Design a protein around this ligand. Structure first.
Ligand SMILES: Nc1ncnc2c1ncn2[C@@H]1O[C@H](COP(=O)(O)OP(=O)(O)OP(=O)(O)O)[C@@H](O)[C@H]1O
Ligand SMILES: Nc1ncnc2c1ncn2[C@@H]1O[C@H](COP(=O)(O)OP(=O)(O)O)[C@@H](O)[C@H]1O
Ligand SMILES: Nc1ncnc2c1ncn2[C@@H]1O[C@H](COP(=O)(O)OP(=O)(O)O)[C@@H](O)[C@H]1O
Lengths: 48, 354, 361
């Protein structure tokens, strides 16, 4: 969705409505940080 | 005759005194452009040996202006939020009141844009409630000249995903009038009389803003079937229930602001909300058949142009006991994977949820 | 002749002169009014202690026209805003503003809008009104006035409509109280709520308490014997012993609009109990045609007065159903966008409601 290459037409209107990246204490939110680095300057805030 | 001198005095007296009206009005209006004190009207009908008023100022004081020196008490009833002179300690002018914090804008959509065409399957039921609700809005004068006051209480009972919410908002859009949505399951507040106050100001807001659509959801949650037990007996929520009942009769004259209640099982309600003037139009909302489900998902995916010539017949065969929401989820699941494609990217949507 | 338009000019001058006198009273006042206080202490004939509602109290003089007998201690008064002297004394009120009276004496020609069983309406009025009008005679001779009356006909002729209409000769405020709403929790301390509603009736002394549903669904489901055991009956016994709530002094009665009189705790029909019960059932053919006529009263269309044929198809239909019948007839005319309602529309409405109730029953 951040690349916005295909969300509009080929796939339905909007990309999947959400993501729940859960899991036991471990890899959780490291992939979120990696996606944040790989994406644009619109970067995450870690709220508790 | 005397008309020449009469009109010569008439026009001058008219224009000069209206100028005096304007002079008066401006001298109070800039004070009306500077009101400061809330108007807690402890109304005392002191007839001159006509009326009077007691105003609780915002600065914690009491001003007993005589005979309500600027405004009529027909429009100024005992309440609050009416302009009070900051210097003359007098009632200036009415102004909109406060809609009970939450009710100020709980979830009020100013105008819904969803159309009647994108929903379907229950077209007979949707046309019935259109005749019972939307027609009393557009052709309200037809009912007025007929002599029959339209009914207000329409109860849409049926399993979730049958499109009660879209239909209600589409009906409100067709009426082009105000739409107010009530989140029923969260109306159960620990505060004493909180739900009573929320329903009171919700009806007040609907009355103040056009012939509205009061769309109260989860009527089963709001009202129990009086199946009292040792665990619970619907003690407090009965207060919220009787308030709603007493507020149903407020708009009987001029027949505006319709009540639309959405639930799944009508039978969980006692035979008290069901009445001619109260909730009367109980409309079934069944799960659509294979044809209706296929048409609904086709309409939802109409804005999707990826896989040409998909008749959705296998989808209709595989859409056993699914809702309009489930059909929408099925088609947007294809609308998430179609980067399958034709007649086979639809099944997994239902399988994902469980 | 321009002089014949004098009348129109006179109307214009009168119309604006009303606005001009209104504005003259609006600007001539231009007053600051008076601050409101309470008489904290009279002190003496000359100086008085008046406390503002929000702090300071002052040693002020009194209005020349007023006297100390009109001022009194602990009474709301008005002080001059600047000179700080008593200007006028005002009465005060307090309001509980919660669960108060909702329906009042103002009412429609219900006496004529009921139609059916007018004799039954007269009988209930005969039982109720006289102790309600002049209860002092009952104390004067030493007889206890009745408490109220019972009503049958679970879905039939409007019991609530009767409770409204009968108060026409009564000039009282009918109150629609629910038995579940009044008992609340399943404890004997439910008498707190009846005390509040009776106090509300004591504040609005000419008041009839119209009960909604005491024998919860008398036709089926759970009766007084089933489900809540004796909880309803004990709470009714609370209103029973309320009968000493100054029946001579208080213009309060209680109408019990049960569905079915089958399970009503026959211990509550003894002398000193609710006592009187008036029989209301589904309207007969005569009452049915009368209520059809009054329902069609507001409807002015071509149609016909063929009410008996409508009665034949719609026999044993309650007054609310027949009101729904007339509304459905209007719905049929308007769904078809016709400004005419003919007996065929009535036939369609009667057939629709008959089929609907037949399927629902
Ligand atoms: N796949 C991984 N590769 C490298 N380091 C990882 C990985 N998963 C977790 N870690 C390490 O775990 C630590 C915290 O990881 P992460 O930020 O994903 O979790 P968190 O925010 O602390 O919470 P939780 O453990 O509950 O998910 C870091 O030191 C990170 O390097
Ligand atoms: N006839 C229909 N046409 C299009 N979408 C529908 C229809 N019925 C249901 N939906 C879908 O269902 C969702 C509404 O669900 P909901 O209002 O909870 O169902 P219900 O009103 O039966 O409780 C919407 O997001 C919509 O996409
Ligand atoms: N005899 C009647 N005449 C006119 N209207 C009636 C009559 N009986 C019932 N109604 C209508 O029924 C509605 C409610 O009646 P209700 O008091 O619920 O009757 P019941 O208690 O027997 O069900 C009222 O709005 C009233 O207009």
């Amino acid at each position: 969705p951040l690349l916005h290459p295909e969300r509009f037409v080929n796939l339905g209107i909007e990309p999947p409505k959400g993501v729940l990246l859960f899991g036991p204490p471990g890899t959780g939110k490291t992939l979120c940080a990696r996606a944040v680095a790989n994406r644009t300057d619109a970067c995450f805030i870690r709220v508790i | 005759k005397i008309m020449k001198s009469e009109v010569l005095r008439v026009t001058h007296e008219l224009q000069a005194m209206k100028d005096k009206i304007k002079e008066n009005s401006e001298k109070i209006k800039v004070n009306k452009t500077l009101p400061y004190l809330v108007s807690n009207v402890i109304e005392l009908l002191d007839v001159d040996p006509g009326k009077c008023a007691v105003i609780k100022t915002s600065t914690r004081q009491t001003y007993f202006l005589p005979v309500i020196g600027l405004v009529d008490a027909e429009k100024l009833k005992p309440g609050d939020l009416v302009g009070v002179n900051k210097d003359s300690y007098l009632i200036l002018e009415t102004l909109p009141t406060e809609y009970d914090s939450r009710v100020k804008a709980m979830e009020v959509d100013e105008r819904p844009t969803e159309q009647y065409s994108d929903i379907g399957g229950l077209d007979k039921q949707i046309q019935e409630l259109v005749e019972a609700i939307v027609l009393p809005m557009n052709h309200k004068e037809k009912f007025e000249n007929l002599g029959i006051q339209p009914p207000k209480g329409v109860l849409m009972y049926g399993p979730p995903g049958t499109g009660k919410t879209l239909l209600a908002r589409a009906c409100a859009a067709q009426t082009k009038a105000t739409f107010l949505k009530l989140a029923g399951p969260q109306l159960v507040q620990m505060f004493i009389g909180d739900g009573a106050k929320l329903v009171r100001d919700a009806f007040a807001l609907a009355k103040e803003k056009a012939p509205s659509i009061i769309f109260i959801d989860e009527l089963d949650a709001i009202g129990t079937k009086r199946f009292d037990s040792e665990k619970a007996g619907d003690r407090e929520v009965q207060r919220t229930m009787l308030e709603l009942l007493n507020q149903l009769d407020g708009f009987q004259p001029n027949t505006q602001v319709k009540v639309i209640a959405a639930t799944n099982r009508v039978d969980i309600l006692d035979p008290a909300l069901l009445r001619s003037g109260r909730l009367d139009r109980k409309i079934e909302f069944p799960m659509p058949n294979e044809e209706a489900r296929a048409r609904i998902m086709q309409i939802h995916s109409r804005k999707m142009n990826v896989s040409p010539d998909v008749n959705y017949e296998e989808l209709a065969r595989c859409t056993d006991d699914f809702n309009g929401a489930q059909c929408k989820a099925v088609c947007v699941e294809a609308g998430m994977i179609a980067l399958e494609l034709t007649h086979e990217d639809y099944m997994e949507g239902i399988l994902e949820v469980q | 002749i321009d002089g014949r338009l004098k009348e129109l000019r006179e109307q214009l001058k009168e119309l604006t002169k009303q606005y001009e006198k209104s504005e003259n009273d609006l600007k001539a006042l231009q007053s600051v009014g008076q601050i409101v206080g309470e008489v904290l202490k009279q002190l003496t004939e000359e100086k008085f202690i008046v406390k503002a509602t929000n702090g300071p109290r002052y040693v002020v003089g009194c209005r020349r026209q007023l006297d100390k007998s009109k001022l009194k201690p602990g009474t709301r008064v008005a002080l001059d805003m600047t000179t700080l002297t008593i200007m006028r004394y005002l009465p005060r009120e307090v309001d509980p503003l919660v669960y108060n009276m909702s329906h009042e004496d103002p009412g429609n020609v219900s006496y004529s809008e009921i139609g059916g069983l007018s004799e039954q309406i007269r009988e209930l009025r005969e039982v109720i009104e006289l102790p309600l009008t002049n209860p002092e005679l009952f104390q004067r001779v030493g007889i206890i006035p009745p408490k109220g009356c019972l009503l049958y006909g679970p879905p039939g002729t409007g019991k609530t409509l009767l409770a409204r209409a009968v108060a026409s000769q009564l000039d009282c405020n009918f109150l629609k109280v629910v038995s579940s709403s009044i008992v609340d929790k399943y404890i004997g301390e439910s008498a707190r709520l009846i005390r509040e509603m009776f106090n509300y009736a004591r504040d609005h002394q000419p008041c009839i308490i119209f009960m909604d549903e005491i024998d919860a669904i008398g036709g089926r489901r759970f009766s007084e014997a089933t489900s809540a055991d004796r909880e309803i009956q004990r709470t009714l016994m609370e209103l029973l012993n309320q009968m000493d709530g100054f029946d001579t002094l208080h213009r309060v009665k209680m109408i019990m609009a049960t569905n079915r009189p089958d399970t009503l705790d026959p211990a509550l029909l003894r002398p000193g109990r609710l006592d009187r019960k008036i029989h209301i059932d589904l309207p007969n053919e005569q009452a049915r045609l009368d209520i059809l006529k009054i329902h069609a009263g507001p409807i002015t269309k071509h149609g016909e007065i063929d009410y008996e044929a409508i009665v034949k198809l719609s026999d044993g239909f309650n007054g609310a159903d027949l009101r729904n019948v007339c509304t459905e007839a209007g719905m049929f005319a308007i769904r078809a966008d016709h400004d005419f309602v003919v007996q065929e529309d009535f036939m369609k409405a009667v057939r629709k409601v008959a089929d609907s109730k037949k399927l629902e029953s």
